[PDB]
Design a protein around this ligand. Structure first.
Ligand SMILES: [Cl-]
Ligand SMILES: [Cl-]
Ligand SMILES: [Zn+2]
Ligand SMILES: [Zn+2]
Lengths: 349, 349
């Protein structure tokens, strides 16, 4: 397949970007694809709901009283807005830990507007400012809850990371050896697996949400997955922030799906069963995963929004809240439009 | 044909980027290649030496007394450092123009350190700060020199832009219809032509420098090309700025070559004849042009530096000054090395 997103200047090709995507049902069966839907792919932050599941399944973590917004922050790549930093500090208090216990580092904010404020202030970001700070507090919580020590909670030999590694493989329905591990920007183990299994994780999230809402008896795992979905959809501003794709996406859809960014341009969406999912040929929930081969985020958001339109997910009115991402502005320094974005890719069934 | 630069996280593929490259002799004969060496490509700022030639060949421009550093700024994508703004203003004064005559617009600086200083002072960049401001003053100069009027100097129907279009096609050895035109970020016509012809332009620059140095009877155009080469090599800080690839590259090579960035990740180099170029099998100067298909600038500089090493251009000590670009750091927020860059491409003859 030769599936691309392409930018032009006056009709002349500027850049082209290879697209990979998987659309799967709740059991992970492949329904539609772009590119190579089984591309071995670092999920990066798109794995965070699976890491939050490992946190929430750690015995004793329930006693700390994390609320839904705290869980959404565990699932976040937040913009380090003051509310994200404050909630991180409030979560540290719940587990009687301190910022010095964190093993993630500060970085320039993922939001340009926040980062400009920091620059004006000469603000130096610290550990609680990390976009991953919520995940790290949850990992510290789990380490405290099982009692072997918080030192080294971020290292592969720690039981919290053994729990994460098993949980990821289980949600993917993969043997341990089919998940590879590197080290994240936030200094935790981070997984790679075929792209379609990232879709599978998010189909399982949305499916658990459907079962919870229907009143079905659920395993402890499915109940926790439903809780994670509900937390992300109820507090999408915790998952990213003002003006961010994931937040704007989840607000527009008002509970019908959850979406999550991975660094270097992966994206995952879990869609609750609907007229649209039935029209796509499945009787339950759906999962979507996307990777832009070269890592370009602006192209990722254009492609994800185009894919939602092609799949019929939402309505023109709902998806129109994402118009600035769908068709990125190509306006020069004098206000003249110089080109645009095109989608020469073809979904295959 | 399948030529990539690949980044990894712990040996796991993160992103990959398709590379196109042409290495040509002084007549444009293809000597080595990556990818598609004739890819139709927007040269963007890498066309600036051709545009400077059109300016310098305009009747009467010699009377303004532009010096080598002014010509270097005509060829620049500068960082908007105070010295670039000051030289822009001095060039405007040479032609008795003012900032309001410029038809380029301000933008965030190409240098992070300049841009952070601006953010701290709440500085809003204006036309005089454009990375293309030196080209624009040169175009105003040519318009005024032939009595065409400054108004509209940037529009395709203006005789200055007629001269630019002719000069570009002639340097490429192309018919007019083989060069396509869009509108630049700086609001001028900007050309697209086969990537190898960008290398041809720069081989002609270095060839002319060789012929000037050898005291050959040069055409006036060759003499002006030699002047442009000399100006860029003598004043590389004008062409980009502190810490910028083009500046560090040209300083390391100390007159042996010139190099120039194009936006969306094109690069061009003109190499004077040397033991290295003779070892590559040509008896004259050579040109190099590169495009990263997806537009990533970090990967461009890594690839260009790797190509100089494969081609044997420079000494190991000279190219070690570019080590930070050749293998970009992949260290996380806690100081842990998480990945690297690889060059599985192979130069073909
Ligand atoms: Cl990293
Ligand atoms: Cl533009
Ligand atoms: Zn992280
Ligand atoms: Zn320009």
């Amino acid at each position: 397949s030769e599936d691309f997103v392409v930018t032009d200047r006056g009709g002349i090709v500027e850049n082209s970007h290879r697209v990979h995507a998987a659309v799967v049902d709740a059991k992970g069966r492949l329904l539609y694809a772009l590119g190579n839907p089984t591309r071995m792919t670092l999920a990066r932050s798109a794995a965070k709901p699976a890491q939050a599941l490992a946190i929430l399944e750690t015995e004793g973590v329930a006693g700390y009283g994390f609320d839904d917004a705290d869980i959404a922050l565990m699932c976040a790549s937040h913009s380090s807005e003051d509310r994200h930093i404050a909630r991180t500090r409030a979560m540290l208090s719940k587990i009687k830990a301190e910022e010095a216990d964190l093993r993630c580092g500060g970085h320039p904010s993922l939001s340009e507007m926040v980062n400009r404020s920091w620059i004006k202030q000469d603000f130096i970001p610290t550990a609680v400012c990390s976009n991953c700070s919520g995940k790290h507090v949850g990992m510290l919580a789990g380490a405290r809850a099982i009692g072997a020590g918080t030192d080294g909670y971020h290292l592969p030999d720690h039981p919290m990371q053994g729990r994460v590694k098993r949980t990821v493989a289980e949600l993917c329905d993969l043997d341990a050896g089919d998940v590879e591990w590197g080290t994240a920007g936030c200094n935790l183990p981070t997984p790679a697996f075929p792209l379609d299994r990232l879709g599978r994780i998010y189909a399982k999230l949305a499916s658990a949400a459907d079962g919870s809402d229907a009143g079905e008896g659920q395993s402890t795992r499915c109940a926790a997955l439903a809780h994670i979905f509900r937390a992300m959809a109820r507090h999408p501003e915790m998952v990213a922030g003002e003006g961010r794709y994931c937040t704007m996406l989840m607000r527009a859809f008002d509970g019908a799906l959850v979406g999550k960014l991975g660094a270097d341009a992966s994206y995952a969406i879990g869609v609750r069963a609907s007229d649209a999912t039935r029209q796509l040929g499945t009787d339950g929930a759906l999962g979507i995963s996307v990777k832009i081969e070269d890592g370009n985020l602006e192209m990722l958001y254009a492609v994800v929004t185009e894919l939602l339109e092609r799949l019929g997910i939402g309505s023109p009115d709902v998806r129109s809240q994402l118009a600035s991402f769908h068709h990125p502005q190509r306006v020069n320094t004098m206000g003249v439009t110089t080109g645009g974005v095109s989608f020469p890719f073809k979904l295959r069934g």
